[PDB]
Amino acid sequence: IETPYYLIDKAKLTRNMERIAHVREKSGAKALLALKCFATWSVFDLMRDYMDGTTSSSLFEVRLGRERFGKETHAYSVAYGDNEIDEVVSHADKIIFNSISQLERFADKAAGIARGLRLNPQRLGEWDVPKVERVMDRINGFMIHNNNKDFGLFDRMLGEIEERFGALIARVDWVSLGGGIHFTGDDYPVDAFSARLRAFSDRYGVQIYLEPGEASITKSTTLEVTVLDTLYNGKNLAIVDSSIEAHMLDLLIYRETAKVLPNEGSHSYMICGKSCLAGDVFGEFRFAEELKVGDRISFQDAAGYTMVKKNWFNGVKMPAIAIRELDGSVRTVREFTYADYEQSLS
Amino acid sequence: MIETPYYLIDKAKLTRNMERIAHVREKSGAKALLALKCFATWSVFDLMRDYMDGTTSSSLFEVRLGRERFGKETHAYSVAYGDNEIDEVVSHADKIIFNSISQLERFADKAAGIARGLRLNPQRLGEWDVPKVERVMDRINGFMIHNNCENKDFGLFDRMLGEIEERFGALIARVDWVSLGGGIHFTGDDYPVDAFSARLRAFSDRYGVQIYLEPGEASITKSTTLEVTVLDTLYNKNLAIVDSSIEAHMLDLLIYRETAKVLPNEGSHSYMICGKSCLAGDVFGEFRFAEELKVGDRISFQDAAGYTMVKKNWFNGVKMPAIAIRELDGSVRTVREFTYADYEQSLS
């Protein structure tokens, strides 16, 4: 009810889930939710019916995956600590190491569960075939990541990978290929994409893992804000009860804008957060009627990489997490209060 | 005992800052308020209280935090007040400041019981047009002006204060308090603290106003470190991974694309030190070390108190750093440890 709040629509999430289900059946591949992108666990009950588990990159994520999602739990991390590696292992079905040194340091601890290594086919992952051959005895699979704007690109990226590591991929029995692939987008060639995954899986005799983050949750969630103030300094301005630094940090980090629908009308306003930063700007949009204090605005496609990195910048009110249920009913899962804010600080 | 990462607030170094602040307050008669947007680690407010005059805030939660845990004078500011909040803001604040005439006109009635101020823009933040201001002088009492930024030079501050008199001098004389904001690094070693106090005196004397300073960074400068461990070593440059992330823990470094600080930054092993994140740009900096870095080695990022703790997050689910204090003793007291349940509870 009270702005700001993230709103996840179960129906829109459903549509994506049904699209993942088809890809899984058509492709033979398994789809794991990338928790680094989306970890709002109160909707896992829905998502788990359609996916194969989760993929994580920290202790907290692998634990959340095991306790709230279940099914297959993969564990990755750029680097594990000695202090945490046992608990990571206890939660994971598979563990993937970023490097050989890491592999060598922890493989003994990860006895009992399938172990993997990340390969780099161009930072992260090994590249040196001859070097990797020496540890083949210790691992079961690979994570190979390189993201896909179109499908043509993916196909090429996949080829580039055979040429690099085909010989190695042949001697193992699973591979995960990461995310970046928009195979839940309306006009994506799902059939050809699946065919291609079967070709790779038959050739090498491996189980393919997909790690959709964005594709799991595109166009399912909105950020609902209220207009607090309106003004003219070169352009029509509107300030809303939100801040891109606190609530949509990727906009700021990557100097991107938000989405509003429809983006039509005669009045364009540039939309800003409740703070005084140069950058604090959702973007510039069009509306049919003039903006007034009290008006409601929805930023679209706000589920990925946002709630997972919201913060208390300036002590601005943190947006509640809410769900629209399949029947149209809207319920609040989580309100953040003064207490939350105070406890984050000491 | 304590594991990395953690932010370590050095009690003795923080106090050094606090004493230089007091000295200014004493010499100048100006008052100093901690800017909560920079630093709001309230477990050390008891230490800062006796050297400062209050807090300034830019949100409901900040004004409440300053009133409830800091005490003394609380100032409220916002770019845009919410109607469902204003009344609560007013009840915590001693002074309230509005960004624009319209905000003031809008909220005048609700703020009637306390001193009201208006932000002035010397250069969408503050009013610049004297005539429009003048029409609303029967409703305020004070001005806020915050131009300085990383201002580490007294000469430059001196000129900025000069251009302030020329644009608004006539109006300033007529009110009874002014806040000169923050961004002024008067707690730096070698700053002409007494010249600066004397310049504060003269402005306050000429205009018959009480001066407020809003030091954020200057309260907390060089007081705090972020302690980390190396977890893996790699040869791509030489690379070392630490148990932290600039995105989650020192987000200003990512936002502004700056690098962290190490001591001494010397020796002939040059390392890129990177965070535990997946992200490409999760890099603290290229540093010099005297000896080859090994898994287990401890690294301290310097000057990590400002704009760090207030904006930390759970990106990647990486472990959030504990909050700790180095006491006089030299012992480390753990104030707050973030656990799985904090992470889980932030997501649903």
Strand pairing partners for B226?
B7, B301
CA B48, B51, B55, B56 torsion-angle sign: negative
Q: How many residues appear in chain A? A: 346
- A314 closest CB neighbour out of B3, B59, B277: B59
Residue pointed to by tokens 């002939």 = B268
Q: Note whether A317 contacts B344, CB cutoff 8 Å.
A: no
CB atoms within 10 A of CB B72: 16
Task: Name the token pair of B86.
Answer: 């204003």
Fold for the domain defined by B11-221: TIM Barrel (3.20.20)
Q: Looking at this protein, which amino acid is placed at residue A247?
A: H
Contacts of A179 in chain B (CB under 8 A): none
Task: Name the token pair of B261.
Answer: 């600080």
B154: helix, strand or coil: helix
The C-alpha of A17 sits at a distance from chain B's nearest C-alpha, in angstroms, of 20
Q: In what order do the strands lie in the sheet with B31-32?
A: B31-32, B210-213, B177-179, B142-144, B115-119, B95-98, B73-77, B54-57, B34-35
Residues with Cβ within 8 Å of B148's Cβ and at least 6 positions away in sequence, in order, are B157, B160, B180, B181, B182, B183, B184
Contacts of B124 in chain A (CB under 8 A): 231, 233, 237, 272
- B-facing residues of A in 36-55 (CB < 8 A) are 36, 39-42
- Give yes or no for A120 touching B (CB within 8 A): no
CA distances from B265 to B50, B240, B262, B291 (A): 36, 15, 6, 12
Residue A250 annotated in ligand binding: yes
| Phi, then psi, of B6 in degrees rounded to 5 | -150, 155
Q: Looking at this protein, which amino acid is placed at residue B272?
A: M
- Give yes or no for B78 touching A (CB within 8 A): yes
Helix, strand and coil content of chain B, in percent to the nearest 5, comes to: 35, 25, 40
- CA separation for the pair B252, A313 (Å, rounded): 11
B60: helix, strand or coil: helix
Q: Based on DSSP, count helices (H) and strands (E) in chain A, helices before strands.
A: 12, 16
Decide yes or no: CATH 3.90.1720.10 for domain A10-218: no
Domains in chain A: boundaries: 1-9+219-346, 10-218
Given a contact cutoff of 8 angstroms between Cβ atoms, the answer to whether A76 and A110 are in contact is no
- CA separation for the pair A148, A126 (Å, rounded): 21
Task: Name the token pair of B299.
Answer: 């690294």
Residues with Cβ within 8 Å of A24's Cβ and at least 6 positions away in sequence, in order, are A30, A31, A50, A51, A52
- CA separation for the pair A240, B80 (Å, rounded): 8
CA distances from A279 to A237, A275, B182, B219 (A): 14, 10, 19, 25
Q: At what angle do helices B11-28 and B193-207 cross, to 10 degrees?
A: 40
Report CA dihedral (A66, A70, A74, A79) to the nearest 10 degrees.
-20
Contacts of A275 in chain B (CB under 8 A): 58, 79
Q: Looking at this protein, which amino acid is placed at residue B43?
A: S
Q: Note whether B59 contacts A316, CB cutoff 8 Å.
A: yes
| Short-list B179, B218, B184, CA closest to B20 | B218
Given a contact cutoff of 8 angstroms between Cβ atoms, the answer to whether A211 and A221 are in contact is no
Given a contact cutoff of 8 angstroms between Cβ atoms, the answer to whether B108 and B98 are in contact is no
For residue A306, give the DSSP letter.
S
The structural architecture, per CATH, of the domain B2-10+222-348 is Beta Barrel (2.40)
Residue pointed to by tokens 């004004």 = B63
CA distances from B142 to B13, B58, B176, B212 (A): 34, 17, 6, 11
The coordinates were experimentally obtained by: X-ray
Alpha helices in chain A (DSSP H): 10-27, 44-47, 59-64, 85-91, 100-106, 129-133, 151-169, 190-204, 214-217, 244-247, 249-253, 338-343
A240: helix, strand or coil: strand
- Give the DSSP H or E segment for A73: strand A72-77
Strand pairing partners for A324?
A9, A330
- CATH assignment of A1-9+219-346, among 3.40.50.1370, 3.30.930.10, 2.40.37.10, 1.10.1530.10: 2.40.37.10
Given a contact cutoff of 8 angstroms between Cβ atoms, the answer to whether A315 and A342 are in contact is no
- Give the DSSP H or E segment for B322: strand B322-326
CA distances from B339 to A37, A60, B316, B318 (A): 20, 9, 15, 11
Given a contact cutoff of 8 angstroms between Cβ atoms, the answer to whether A17 and A9 are in contact is no
The C-alpha of A97 sits at a distance from chain B's nearest C-alpha, in angstroms, of 11
- CA separation for the pair B271, B279 (Å, rounded): 18
Given a contact cutoff of 8 angstroms between Cβ atoms, the answer to whether B153 and B184 are in contact is no
For chain B, first and last CA: distance in Å? 31
Contacts of A59 in chain B (CB under 8 A): 317, 319
